[PDB]
Each structure stands twice: as C-alpha cells, then as structure tokens.
Amino acid sequence: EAPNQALLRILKETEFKKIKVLGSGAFGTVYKGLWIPEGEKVKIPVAIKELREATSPKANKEILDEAYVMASVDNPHVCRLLGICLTSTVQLITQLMPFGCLLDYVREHKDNIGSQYLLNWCVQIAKGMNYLEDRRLVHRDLAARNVLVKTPQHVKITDFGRAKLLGAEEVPIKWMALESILHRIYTHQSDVWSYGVTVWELMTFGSKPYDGIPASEISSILEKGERLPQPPICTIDVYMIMVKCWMIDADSRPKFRELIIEFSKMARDPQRYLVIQGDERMHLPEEDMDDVVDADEYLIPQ
Numbered sequence: 001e002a003p004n005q006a007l008l009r010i011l012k013e014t015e016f017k018k019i020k021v022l023g024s025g026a027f028g029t030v031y032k033g034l035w036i037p038e039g040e041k042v043k044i045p046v047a048i049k050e051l052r053e054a055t056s057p058k059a060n061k062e063i064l065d066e067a068y069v070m071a072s073v074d075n076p077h078v079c080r081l082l083g084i085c086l087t088s089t090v091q092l093i094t095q096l097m098p099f100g101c102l103l104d105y106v107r108e109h110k111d112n113i114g115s116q117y118l119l120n121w122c123v124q125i126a127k128g129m130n131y132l133e134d135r136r137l138v139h140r141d142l143a144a145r146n147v148l149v150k151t152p153q154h155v156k157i158t159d160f161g162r163a164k165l166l167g168a169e170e171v172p173i174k175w176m177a178l179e180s181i182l183h184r185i186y187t188h189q190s191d192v193w194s195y196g197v198t199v200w201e202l203m204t205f206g207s208k209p210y211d212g213i214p215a216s217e218i219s220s221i222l223e224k225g226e227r228l229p230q231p232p233i234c235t236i237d238v239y240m241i242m243v244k245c246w247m248i249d250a251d252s253r254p255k256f257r258e259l260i261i262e263f264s265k266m267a268r269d270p271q272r273y274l275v276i277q278g279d280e281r282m283h284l285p286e287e288d289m290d291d292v293v294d295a296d297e298y299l300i301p302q
C-alpha cells in the first residue's frame with residue numbers, strides 16, 4: 001500500500017465569501033461562493049459545505065474523513081477538494097458545479113434531454129468510478145443525486161462521505177447491492193450495482209426506484225429475483241446492461257472499464273440504443289467576472 005501524498009490545503013475565511021445557500025439539509029448547509037486565493041488575482045467559483053452551529057465532535061470526525069478522500073482524488077469525472085477552513089467549524093471548499101446534481105437536472109430538463117447526452121453521462125460516470133477502483137476506493141453511495149453537472153457535457157461524482165478503501169472494516173437501501181443489504185459487504189462490484197441504478201434513474205428521467213415500496217421490503221423483493229423495470233426509452237441492449245449490474249453473483253457483474261467500453265460504443269450510434277421523441281430537435285445550454293477561473297483551470301504545484 002503506497003503513501004498518500006495528497007496536499008491538504010488550508011484556507012482563511014478571509015479568502016472566500018459565501019453568496020447563497022445552494023442547499024440545506026440535515027446537520028449542515030452548502031453555499032455557493034467565491035474564493036480568491038491569496039495574492040493570486042484569480043476568482044474561483046466554489047461550493048462550501050459546513051455543519052451546524054452544533055459542533056459535536058463525532059460529526060467533525062465524519063466531515064474530515066470526507067475531506068481526506070476528496071483531497072486524494074484527481075479525475076475529470078470525480079469532484080476534488082480545493083481545501084478546508086478551520087475557523088469555527090470545518091468547511092469543505094470544492095469547485096462549484098453550476099447546473100447542480102444530475103438527478104435534479106434530468107427531472108428539470110427531460111424535454112430537452114437527448115440520447116447522446118444520456119449515453120455520455122453513462123460513459124463519464126463509469127470513468128469516474130473506474131478511477132476510484134484504480135485508487136481502490138468504494139464510493140458506497142453512488143446515485144444520480146451524487147453526480148454533479150459542471151456543464152451538460154461534463155459530469156462528476158461526489159459525496160465521498162460513505163467512501164471506504166477496499167477490504168476495510170470501517171443508508172440508501174434502494175441503490176444498494178443485495179450482498180451489501182444482507183451482509184454489509186461492499187466491493188467495487190457492489191459499487192457497480194449502484195451504477196446500474198443510477199443509470200436507471202437517468203433513463204427514467206429521475207423516476208424514483210421501487211417507488212412506493214418500503215426499504216425493509218426491498219431485500220425480499222430482490223431476493224425473489226425482482227428487479228427494476230425497463231425504461232420506455234431503453235432498448236433491450238441498454239436494459240440488458242443494467243440487468244447485468246444486478247446479478248446475484250457479483251463477479252458476473254460488469255467491470256467499470258467494460259461499462260465505459262460498452263456505453264462508449266453506444267454513444268457512436270446513440271439513436272440505435274435510446275429511443276426518444278424529437279431526439280434530433282433537442283439542444284442544451286457578481287459584476288466583475290474578468291478574473292473568473294474555473295477550478296479545473298486553476299492548478300497548483302504537485
């Protein structure tokens with residue numbers, strides 16, 4: 001096992017300003033903000049995630065594990081941590097994704113969303129996921145809600161709070177592989193099953209999974225051999241791939257690098273694998289912004 005030499009960057013609260021609340025849930029809230037690095041003359045659009053005024057020690061121990069992971073990843077399809085702030089309670093700063101999470105995005109734009117885009121996201125997510133596998137990381141919470149849109153073309157994975165290294169002792173039931181539900185067993189392959197669900201979410205345009213069914217129920221349903229329905233826009237090819245992600249024997253399930261390859265192919269003839277009405281028709285998208293630099297553009301030594 002190699003040494004992790006990721007640099008953890010420490011930021012002063014003076015370096016950045018919160019502007020809106022992007023989302024508020026549970027313990028903590030995420031802000032849209034601007035970060036200007038010290039003496040750099042660049043402004044970077046950022047999200048800032050912080051917990052409640054309650055500063056309880058256990059919660060911090062959870063946010064710092066997350067930061068740790070996000071600090072340790074470098075892929076175009078994975079969200080990375082810019083740095084952290086220690087001023088009262090910990091905050092995580094990372095690059096902002098303007099269009100929000102993918103799940104919201106498909107629901108909002110279904111009528112302008114096309115086969116090429118859906119296939120591309122699939123390729124992209126599988127890429128981010130393959131990277132994590134390379135780094136031996138199990139996301140353990142992959143959902144459409146945890147994919148973020150920089151742009152319609154570009155998406156990245158996020159929410160590494162539940163992330164573990166593979167083979168480590170250390171709840172979203174619906175996205176969970178059966179082995180995980182029965183035995184709390186997680187492997188990259190468990191991760192793969194979740195990918196299949198995420199894909200199902202996009203093809204059904206944000207439809208809820210096993211809607212109307214209680215989670216306690218779900219283990220039984222899966223046990224019986226039940227699985228998610230084939231989406232209307234889905235060819236048998238595409239659905240066939242999803243179904244492979246949901247096999248009892250996890251070694252029979254596809255590898256993320258296979259998934260990249262198969263969806264990659266489909267993306268060269270997108271109309272053959274996804275049937276959507278008016279597919280051809282569809283197209284998709286504070287005073288001084290001169291100095292605005294995206295995080296992807298902004299780079300540091302190392």
Ligand SMILES: CC(C)n1c(Nc2ccccc2)nc2cnc(Nc3ccc(N4CCN(C)CC4)cc3)nc21
Pocket residue numbers: 022023030047048049092093094095096097098099100101104148158159
């Ligand atoms: C809001 C959460 C999902 N988030 C975290 N979370 C996060 C997790 C760990 C560390 C740092 C951030 N990083 C984020 C980075 N970027 C964005 N962007 C973004 C998020 C939400 C929205 N909207 C606008 C449309 N609304 C209908 C729904 C809310 C627009 C843009 N969100 C992030």
Ligand SMILES: [Cl-]
Pocket residue numbers: 171172173174175215
């Ligand atoms: Cl759930």
